[PDB]
Every structure is written in structure tokens, then in C-alpha cells.
Amino acid sequence: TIHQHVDESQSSLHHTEKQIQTFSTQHNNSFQELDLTNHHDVTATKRELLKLIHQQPATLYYELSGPNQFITNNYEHLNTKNMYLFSTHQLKFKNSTYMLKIYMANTPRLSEIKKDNRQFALIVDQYDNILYANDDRFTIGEKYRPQQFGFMNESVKLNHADHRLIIYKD
Amino acid sequence: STIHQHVDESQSSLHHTEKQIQTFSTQHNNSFQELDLTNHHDVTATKRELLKLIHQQPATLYYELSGPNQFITNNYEHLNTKNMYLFSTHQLKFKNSTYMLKIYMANTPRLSEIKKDNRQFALIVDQYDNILYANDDRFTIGEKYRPQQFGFMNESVKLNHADHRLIIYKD
Amino acid sequence: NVLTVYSPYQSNLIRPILNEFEKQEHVKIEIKHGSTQVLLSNLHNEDFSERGDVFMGGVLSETIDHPEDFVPYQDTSVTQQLEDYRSNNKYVTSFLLMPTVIVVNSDLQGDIKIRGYQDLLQPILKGKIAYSNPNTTTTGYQHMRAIYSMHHRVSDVHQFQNHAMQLSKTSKVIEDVAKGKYYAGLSYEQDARTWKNKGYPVSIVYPIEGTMLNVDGIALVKNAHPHPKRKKLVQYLTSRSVQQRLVAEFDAKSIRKDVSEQSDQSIENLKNIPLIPKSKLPDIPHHKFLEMIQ
Amino acid sequence: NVLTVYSPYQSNLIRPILNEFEKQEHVKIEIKHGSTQVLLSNLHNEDFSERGDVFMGGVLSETIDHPEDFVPYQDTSVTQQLEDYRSNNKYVTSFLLMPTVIVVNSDLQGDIKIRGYQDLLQPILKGKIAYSNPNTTTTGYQHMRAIYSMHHRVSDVHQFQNHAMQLSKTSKVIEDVAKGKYYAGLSYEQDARTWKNKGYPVSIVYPIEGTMLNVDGIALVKNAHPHPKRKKLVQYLTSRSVQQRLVAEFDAKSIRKDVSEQSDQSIENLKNIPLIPKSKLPDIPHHKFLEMIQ
Ligand SMILES: O=P(O)(O)OC[C@H]1O[C@H](O)[C@H](O)[C@@H](O)[C@@H]1O
Ligand SMILES: O=P(O)(O)OC[C@H]1O[C@H](O)[C@H](O)[C@@H](O)[C@@H]1O
Secondary structure, three states, X not given: OHHHHHHXXXXXXXXXXXXXXXXXXXXXXXXXXXXOOOHHHHHXXXXXXXXXXXXXXXXXXXXXXXXXXXXXXXXXXXXXXXXXXXXXXXXXXXXXXXXXXXXXXXXXXXXXXXXXXXXXXXXXXXXOEEEEEOOOOOOOOOEOOHHHOOOEEEXXXXXXXXXXXXXXXX | OOXXXXXXXXXXXXXXXXXXXXXXXXXXXXXXXXXXXXXXXXXXXXXXXXXXXXXXXXXXXXXXXXXXXXXXXXXXXXXXXXXXXXXXEEEEEOOOOEEEEEEEEEEOHHHHHXXXXXXXXXXXXXXXXXXXXXXXXXXXXXXXXXXXXXXXXXXXXXXXXXXXXXXXXEO | OOEEEEEXXXXXXXXXXXXXXXXXXXXXXXXXXXXXXXXXXXXXXXXXXXXXXXXXXXOHHHHOOOHHHEEOOOOHHHHHEOHHHOOOOOOEEEEEEEEEXXXXXXXXXXXXXXXXXXXXXXXXXXXXXXXXOOOOOHHHHHHHHHHHHHHOOHHHHHXXXXXXXXXXXXXXXXXXXXXXXXXXXXXXHHHHHHHHHOOOOEEEEOOOOOEOEEEEEEEEEOOOOOOOOHHHHHHHHOOHHHHHHHHHHHOOEEOEOOOOOOOOOXXXXXXXXXXXXXXXXXXXXXXXXXXXXO | OEEEEEEOOOHHHHHHHHXXXXXXXXXXXXXXXOOHHHHHHHHHHOOHHHOOOEEEOXXXXXXXXXXXHEEOOOOOOHHHEOHHXXXXXXXXXXXXXXXXXXXXXXXXXXXXXXXXXXXXXXHHHOOOEEEEOOOOOHHHHHHHHHHHHHHOOHHHHHHHHOOOEEEOOXXXXXXXXXOOOOOEEEEEHHHHHHHHHXXXXXXXXXXXXXXXEEEEEEEEEOOOOOOOOHHHHHHHHOOHHHHHHHHHHHOOEEOEOOOOOOXXXXXXXXXXXXEOOOOOOOOOOXXXXXXXXX
């Protein structure tokens, strides 16, 4: 059912967001000793980021940007504008501050319920801005108007922001 | 509103678009043989004819006229033609060399509207089940459509210009 | 709670700015898009209780036929706006400077010279140029005023209209010119640049006989229950930071003296555009001018 | 009407060439994908009447446990194929040469030296390397023979297995190494190059102790109604133009002297790969080797 899938995805997203915050807090002291102009410290940072990526169910892409680096696991250069921006952090490294952005392209559960159940997913803020979609009739950055559509839908609020996850079936 | 009505309307629209291309190529055989595409005036005259051809039909069409020194196109946004329906390919005799003309269909209003309003998607496949057009993200142009693998409400018809089938379907 | 905005602007220009105002002031903004005069006429027949709050876009200081549909208000930042273009209309606040332009398809042009309104009357261009309905749009109406201002001849207006194809929507002109349906068209600066920046073969021409400059305005709509943040919205739209963002991200021309222009490319700055001087502008009122050229 | 092909190959390698055979011979080809031994075991339990026609991919000349499920055939193209890699198996025709490789994630590697199987046993790599099931896959099985060929020690095979994570699918190894879940993995050349060419941080390592070369084969499947064009397909797959296309468009290593062996861009041709010589290759039959290392 849509209701069962809405609960599962919200719990999975809330867990994933807690692990990211726990990761950043527990690596605060470690990152301040790593200078990202050194090839060893870049490798050590990539190892920690990729380890974090594969501890979560969702398909996540990180972007660590600064003066000398644009470090990412988006090796195929997929358009991050079509992804859910999930967290943004300014991290203190030995040599400079670095911005860490984590994007969610999908989750295995949302992709499966789209394939097997034709249930699509939207993430919108309190002003109806579309922040995530896996249905091509919706574009991230545009407005969601629920009165324009008649699909069975159920929504739940995400904990990390004033965002709503909407799972629907046409 | 039905799939049956939309397949008939889309098939008629596609046949009309293709017949304008065929009539254009037939009627412009001798005209192009007098045009040298290394002359900028003849390039302008060719672009005028191509753009005029585009706007005599409803579908969103992109042309590619390629040869020595030239790649002439109205794909100004550099959209990926691999995600478009290759609709016709012709070798044209110009004064200075032969030039290949390809016409791609990115979409047509009839297929785009029924996708938005009715959630009815469109496939174009050849006799070997190669996907030649799709507006559904679960299907990729160049891959195989395996009918035995889906439960869709669908209706199919053959297009006149090739061994292609238009399939309109709904979940 | 919802603040409704009437606007002939394209969504790509105002939706981002209005989205930021939504987040800052905790209000949802709904936009009604349409031709300027169509929005104004529907607003006029709309009952007092159901009307929106703000009208932004179009030459409001000169084409509002029903001033009783609006509330007098004046932005406190008027003293920071360019003196040539401040509003003389109690109901309107100046917002942006928008040059009207001729758009030319460079793939179709060839050797055809198109430098202004006179070049458009070449017999080679008959039926191959487009414009929008002057009765319903700001752009079509302002262009007819520019054509009339050349020699003050209604025959020049009629000669062009019999030479061109009239379209219902202003944005349809730039789309069909950019896509190669017409050799040229009558558009405005921001719409022309939207399609030129996407790669379309669009050349932007400021008519040499005199370019009509639009002073876009903002007006409060007279309704039963005005939204408590609508005057704050007017302040926001005329603030320096927002005007600076409009020039930086969208190449717009600001109404404020403090904010600097950004043309470099494509073209032009305001000083280098052959604008119709304020003394040559026809002073015939909107409705009366439209009926005169009917 | 339909010619059914069993193949452990990835679709990206064989679907294009089989599509060209479809148009050349006016026949529909359907592919059944899966691990090599899973396809063979399911083929064995598949009812005689419903079986497919052709098996392509995998080391068929050495890992077909049920020869009664296939029909002997001789490709007329053998005289142009490399003499060291022709089939002595009555049912199999040699098709391609596929080096087995170690794939290394260059984002994770750092200073960890990885040049062969022995380097994979470094304690820092414990639990961070992956391989596919040797009982069901060609790739996992061939790698276990390569590890055994080092010193002819079953303990070396067990030592690696206790050090690595076993996956069910061969292509899951390269995907999870490329995406950063594992530091290294046991894969094959064509799969490794597919992900390296997509931009993933994949380094292809030919084990310094001896690289196992796979002689991929083609076999006709024993069925009730063989497709009349299947022997033409075998000739097609071993034909010069098709082998040349596989080398040019897909960087495969041809079985034929005839095709020019174009090795550059990424990674080696055959001469420069430290292949396990014919004297060190274990001659233990397939099933017996699997039980021995159990
Ligand atoms: O469709 P319209 O009524 O012509 O309005 C669309 C645009 O055209 C004019 O040129 C104005 O400068 C703009 O403020 C207006 O948004
Ligand atoms: O999944 P598998 O059984 O490992 O088969 C996948 C591939 O691996 C092997 O290395 C063979 O060289 C290929 O012919 C085969 O297609």
C-alpha cells in the first residue's frame, strides 16, 4: 500500500540523515588534521566518505568543494539539479574550510515501488517547491499544485527540514 | 480520449509529417543540385527551405544536413538526438558534393498531450523489437521492447514509411 | 494567507525572486499569468472580494484604463530611483526598465537588412514577420506607439499590420522567430535574451528610428481584504538587493540609481540605445490610442 | 521463428552485434542472461522441446559438465584463429579471448600495493575485496584456478576466500568496486573496461603471479527443433568483419590472427600480459576442481 511505503521511506530517510549528522560530528576532530592539498589526506577523506555512502540504503552522491578540490563520487557526472539536496555542511580541514553537499538521486525502495507498483515520490517544502521527483511530469525547482492532479496520494513530514514526502499513484 | 482513438490520430499525424518530408525531398531533387553549400547564400537558401519544411507540420522536428565543411541543424539547444526518433535519412545531391539529411522527431503535440492528460505513453519499434522512440523513462531508445514482459493496456498500428509499429499504452 | 500576484512576466523572471520572498515572509504566492490587458480586464470584472493583491509587469503607469481597480501607494525608495523614469502615477511604482526590440532570425536573414521599423516593410518580408495583439498586450501596444512616433502617421501603423502576422501572445513571437517560423518579430529585451541565451539564432535589434522604452510598474489591487504583506512585497521588489539580483542573474535594467547596469554582452547599455526621447513620445491615452488605430 | 541464445555476457557487448545479425538474416534473437553455470544447469533441467539454440560466452570448452546437452559442430573459420586457443571440445567453437583481471578502486587504494593475488592478502584489505561464486560463475572459477596455479596449494585458495567477500553475480563485483564499496575485486577485462570507460575510478590489474586467460566459446544446444539459421550465427560470430568490429567498437581480443589486435588507450594486448603458461595451468576437470577446493 501507499501508506506502508510512505512510513518506510520516511523512516529510511530519517535514519540516513541521522547517520550523516553522526558522521560529521564524529569526524570533526579527524578532518581538522587532514590537509586536502596532501594526496594522503585526500585518500583518507575519500575513504571515510565512501564508507559513509555504503552504510546507507539510499543512492547518495557527495560533493566536497573548496579552493583546491572538487571531490565527488558522481563519476558519471549526473545532473545534481535532478537530485534531492539532502544536507549541506561547512567542514573545517587543516588547510581550509570545505563545503560538503550530499544529494539523494533515489532509494532502492522508491525505485522498486515505482517499477512494481507505479507509485511515484515527491519531496516538497512548505511553499510547494519541488525538491525531489522521480516522475518526469514534475521538475525540481517548480511548484507542486495538488489541485491540478487527481491521484491517490499520502504525505508525511521529514524530520530534518520542513519537507513533505508524498507517495502517489495515478 | 481512448487509446484506440489516439493511435489513429497519432498515426495520421505521423503519416502527414512523413509525407511532407517525402514530398519535400521529391520536389527539391533538382533544386539542390544547383546549390553549393560552400557558398553562404546557398546555405541561407537551404536553411530557409528546411525551416519552412519544419513549420508545415505539427511535430517537433530537428534536421541535420551534414557533408564537407557543413553540419547544418536547427537543434540550437544541442539536444541529444539519440533520444529522438530517427524519422528519415536521405542522400542529397548538391552542386559541390553529396550531403546526408537526417530528420529527427523529438516529440509531437498529439503524443505529448495524451502523456500529460491521459498518462498514455508512446513507443515506436521495428520488426526486431528495437525501440526507436519512447517517452517513458523505463524504456530506452536502442534497447529491446519485450511485449511478453508487460501488462499494459495498449493498441498498436503500423506506420506507412517503414516496418515500424506505433504502440500507445497505459498502466 | 495566499498572496495573489497578477503578472505578464514570464515565470522564469519573477518566480525565483518571489520564491525568496515566500521564504523570508512565510507566505505562499500564487501568480496569474497572461497578457497585460487581459489580466487588467479580467481584474476589472472580478468581484472586489475575490481580487488578488499586487500587479507587477507591463507599462502600468500608462495603460491602466480603470484606476479605480487599484489603491494609491508609493514606494518610499522613490528618491533612489532614476529621475527620468520615476512614476507620475499615484497608483504605480516603477519597477524595471524594459526596452522593446525587433528580434531577427539570423539563419533566415541572409542579405535582408533589418535595422528598424522601415526595414520591416521590405516586400521580401511580407507575411514573414510577427507581432502580438496591441489590444491585449503591453509589447504589441508599445510597438504600435513606436511606429506611430516615427512620422506621427496612422498609415505607418496600418502599413506594418497589413505586412505582418498578428499573434495572440507576446512570447509566441520570440518562440516562433527563434524556431524559424518568422524572419523577424516585435518582442521585448528580456524575452529575446531568454531564447538567444539558449542558443537560438536570435539577433536583438533596437529600432534605429527610435526604440520605445517600457517603464514596468507595480500596483496594489483594490480588494476587500488586502494581504498584510503586499506593501512589504513592493518594498522587496524595489529594494537594492533584489534589483541587483535581477540585473546580475537576468540581465534586467534596474530602476534604481545605486544599482549599476550589466550589459557587456550581449547588447546594449541604456545610454547606447537610440531611445525615443520623452518629448517625442505620443501623449494619446491608452484606450484612445488603441481606438484611433483600429 | 525466434532464435534463443544463452549467454553470460553483458548485454552491452553482444546485443549490438546480434542486432546486426537480426537485420542481416531477418530473424529475431532473444537472449537469456545469467551466470555461466546457472545457465548451463537450467539448460540441463530445461525440457528438450523448449530449449534454446546457441550458447555463447564462458569457458565452455572446459566447464560444460553435461556434454549430452549440446551438438558437435566445426566452424569453417578455425583455420584463421590462433592455434593456442582453438577448441579441443567436440561441442565448442572458440569465440573470444577474455583476460581475468583484478579491479582496484583508485579512490580508495592510496599507498596499498596491489599487483596480484598475493598483495590482496594484506591484512588492511581483509573484508574489503570481493569475488563471484566459483561454483556458478566462469569468472570466480577461473580466478580460483589462477590462485591455485601460483604454488599449487589449496591453502592459497582457502586463504583468499577467508579474506574476501563472495558475491553471487560477477558483474556485482565490478559495480561495487567502481562505486567504492570494496577496495578491489576479481573481475574480467570487458566488464572492468565498461565501468572504467564510464568514468569510475577503476584500475585494471593483471595479476603479476600469472593472469588466467579465458577462451570463450560457442556451442549449439541440443533441442527438438533447431533454428535453421543458428550455424550461420556461429559463422557470423566467428567471421572476420564481426571479430574486427568486436575489437574496434568493444576493445575485445579476437580469437583470429586475421584481426589486427588494436591495444592502446587503457590496458594491454596479449603479449604484455603475464599469462599463466600452458605448463602451469591446472588440468583438473571442472567439477573435480570445485569439489577439491570445497
Ligand atoms: O504579454 P505582454 O502584455 O506584452 O507582457 C509581457 C511583457 O511585455 C512588455 O514588454 C513589458 O515590458 C513586460 O513588463 C511584460 O511582462
Ligand atoms: O557470470 P560469469 O559466469 O562470470 O560470466 C560473465 C563473463 O565472465 C567470464 O570471465 C567469461 O570470460 C565471459 O565469457 C563471461 O561472459
